[PDB]
Amino acid sequence: QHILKNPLIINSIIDKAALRPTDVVLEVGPGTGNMTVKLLEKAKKVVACELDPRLVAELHKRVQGTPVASKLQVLVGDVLKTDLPFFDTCVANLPYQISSPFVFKLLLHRPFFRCAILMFQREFALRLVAKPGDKLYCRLSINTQLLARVDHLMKVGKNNFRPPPKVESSVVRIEPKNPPPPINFQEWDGLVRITFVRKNKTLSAAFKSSAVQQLLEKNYRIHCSVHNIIIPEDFSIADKIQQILTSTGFSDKRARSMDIDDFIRLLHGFNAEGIHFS
Amino acid sequence: QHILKNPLIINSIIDKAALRPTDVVLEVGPGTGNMTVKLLEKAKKVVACELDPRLVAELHKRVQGTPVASKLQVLVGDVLKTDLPFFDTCVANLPYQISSPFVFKLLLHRPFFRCAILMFQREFALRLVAKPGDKLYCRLSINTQLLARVDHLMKVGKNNFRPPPKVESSVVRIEPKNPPPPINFQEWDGLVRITFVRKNKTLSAAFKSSAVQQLLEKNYRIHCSVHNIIIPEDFSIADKIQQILTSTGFSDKRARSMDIDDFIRLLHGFNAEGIHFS
Numbered sequence: 001q002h003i004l005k006n007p008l009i010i011n012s013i014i015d016k017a018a019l020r021p022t023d024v025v026l027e028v029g030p031g032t033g034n035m036t037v038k039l040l041e042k043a044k045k046v047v048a049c050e051l052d053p054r055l056v057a058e059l060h061k062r063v064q065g066t067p068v069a070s071k072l073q074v075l076v077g078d079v080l081k082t083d084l085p086f087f088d089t090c091v092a093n094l095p096y097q098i099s100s101p102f103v104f105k106l107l108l109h110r111p112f113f114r115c116a117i118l119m120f121q122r123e124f125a126l127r128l129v130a131k132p133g134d135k136l137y138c139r140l141s142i143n144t145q146l147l148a149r150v151d152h153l154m155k156v157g158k159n160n161f162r163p164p165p166k167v168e169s170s171v172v173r174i175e176p177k178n179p180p181p182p183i184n185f186q187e188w189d190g191l192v193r194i195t196f197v198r199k200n201k202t203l204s205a206a207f208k209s210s211a212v213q214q215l216l217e218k219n220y221r222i223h224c225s226v227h228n229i230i231i232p233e234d235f236s237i238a239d240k241i242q243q244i245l246t247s248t249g250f251s252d253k254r255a256r257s258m259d260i261d262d263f264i265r266l267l268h269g270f271n272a273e274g275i276h277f278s
Numbered sequence: 279q280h281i282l283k284n285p286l287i288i289n290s291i292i293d294k295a296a297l298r299p300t301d302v303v304l305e306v307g308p309g310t311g312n313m314t315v316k317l318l319e320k321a322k323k324v325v326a327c328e329l330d331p332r333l334v335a336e337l338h339k340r341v342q343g344t345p346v347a348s349k350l351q352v353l354v355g356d357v358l359k360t361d362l363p364f365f366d367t368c369v370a371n372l373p374y375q376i377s378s379p380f381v382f383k384l385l386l387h388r389p390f391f392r393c394a395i396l397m398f399q400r401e402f403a404l405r406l407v408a409k410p411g412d413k414l415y416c417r418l419s420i421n422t423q424l425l426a427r428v429d430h431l432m433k434v435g436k437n438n439f440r441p442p443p444k445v446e447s448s449v450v451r452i453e454p455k456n457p458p459p460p461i462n463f464q465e466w467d468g469l470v471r472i473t474f475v476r477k478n479k480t481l482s483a484a485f486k487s488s489a490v491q492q493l494l495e496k497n498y499r500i501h502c503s504v505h506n507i508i509i510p511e512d513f514s515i516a517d518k519i520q521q522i523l524t525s526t527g528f529s530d531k532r533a534r535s536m537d538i539d540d541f542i543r544l545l546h547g548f549n550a551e552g553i554h555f556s
């Protein structure tokens with residue numbers, strides 16, 4: 001629990017959110033409410049999502065007796081389990097532990113929000129904006145960039161929090177692509193997971209792993225049962241996989257150097273041959 | 279004019295060529311025709327390229343009146359200035375002084391051939407096939423390997439030639455990659471040359487040289503002129519180069535131990551930031 005305490009950084013974060021007076025703002029991790037009290041003056045409603053019941057009670061107390069108190073709803077509990085309401089904008093200062101699952105939750109949330117202004121550890125922020133093959137380019141980079149426009153807005157020193165964290169922080173903007181690309185995110189993430197796990201291995205090597213071959217063969221057999229496709233007696237899932245890698249040109253490539261165009265082509269090429277990822 | 283005169287090595291070279299009866303064989307440097315007369319019996323056509331008109335005249339005489347004479351075409355002159363016809367396989371024994379230009383001629387030749395079996399000086403051969411970082415791993419190794427598969431096939435003692443060369447020799451196989459990487463060679467070689475000057479020192483030391491910083495700043499300014507990108511007054515090429523090396527993880531890497539995909543990645547990292555080596 002690192003409380004953002006520098007008023008200038010808080011004001012800049014709120015400015016970057018470009019609030020409208022009619023906005024519902026989702027605030028995740030309100031801490032002691034340093035940002036909440038300012039958000040409440042600028043928006044129609046603030047929905048603060050907070051894990052710790054003590055910090056919930058104290059937030060209610062902080063706004064008690066003020067003209068804006070009635071514009072605050074506090075949702076108690078783990079945000080990752082919460083069914084999130086409609087919101088226009090999100091500001092968030094969450095622990096590093098939940099940064100990844102929260103980004104994915106945001107990317108799939110409906111109805112679409114307009115933007116999110118988020119505080120993350122520096123490395124996590126750099127990963128979100130990394131290009132092919134930066135050292136920090138990973139599943140997080142490509143999944144975020146597929147579904148959203150993501151920008152690194154500002155560096156924030158550890159000195160700005162109480163108590164200070166051990167690493168520097170960053171403010172990032174995430175604006176979800178609306179409509180999103182016409183791509184099944186579950187399939188996409190299956191392919192991305194498999195190829196990035198060892199992002200430095202060629203795809204040929206990545207797909208040779210027993211765990212990979214076993215699931216892909218199982219799902220392919222299910223596929224064929226649905227679509228009435230004969231599987232020869234001498235079927236080899238290794239050969240089937242390798243011929244797709246060859247035909248798409250990605251066999252000798254490594255996920256760390258592959259962009260969105262590349263993975264879309266690869267996914268298309270697996271799908272055309274009956275391989276569908278979970 | 280070192281003429282190969284060991285029939286067993288001649289037989290072994292022809293064997294490694296894996297001739298098909300329908301093949302057109304380019305033989306560069308046929309000498310006295312020791313290999314030519316054997317090639318003619320196994321291939322559809324032999325196109326022999328020879329610089330010395332005296333040897334050309336003797337080669338015609340050697341096949342004269344034999345049943346395979348009509349399958350021989352002799353192209354007279356410098357093979358480097360010769361527009362080469364289609365050929366399936368190539369066999370070559372040329373002076374050491376033109377090994378490098380001839381290799382890159384073959385690699386740029388279209389349509390693609392299937393394989394070349396070539397005689398080189400020992401050290402030249404060891405450089406072609408060197409792996410990151412064998413002692414002899416160099417610009418020649420990586421430039422050749424970018425475009426071809428290369429194998430050292432056999433050592434050839436100087437006594438096998440008349441007259442003998444001053445050095446030991448090797449037989450190498452070259453098979454062009456088809457398709458090749460879609461990399462502009464002048465661009466690629468710009469990066470390769472720079473980094474291989476001191477192949478045992480790091481990339482950040484290679485990129486700190488005055489002349490290199492001047493080149494890259496000049497090229498970035500050209501890219502920015504093309505795209506109408508404004509360059510701030512306080513622009514630092516040193517800083518921009520360092521950020522790219524840090525982003526990609528290459529600051530402390532050395533050309534002697536970098537493979538092809540390493541160079542592709544580094545080149546992409548510069549090019550995507552507007553910095554070109556051509």
Ligand SMILES: C[S@@+](CC[C@H](N)C(=O)[O-])C[C@H]1O[C@@H](n2cnc3c(N)ncnc32)[C@H](O)[C@@H]1O
Binds near residue numbers: 004055078079093
């Ligand atoms: C004080 S911030 C720490 C983040 C840090 N400043 C950083 O660099 O990003 C953590 C806040 O989020 C709350 N929080 C932690 N986990 C949560 C969760 N799963 N759901 C909702 N709120 C949570 C904490 O109780 C606290 O209010």
Ligand SMILES: C[S@@+](CC[C@H](N)C(=O)[O-])C[C@H]1O[C@@H](n2cnc3c(N)ncnc32)[C@H](O)[C@@H]1O
Binds near residue numbers: 357376398399
């Ligand atoms: C190159 S010489 C010497 C080869 C020697 N065994 C070696 O490894 O260096 C063998 C043949 O190549 C011919 N030759 C030399 N330069 C040539 C060129 N530029 N184009 C075509 N043939 C050439 C010579 O006349 C001779 O017939």
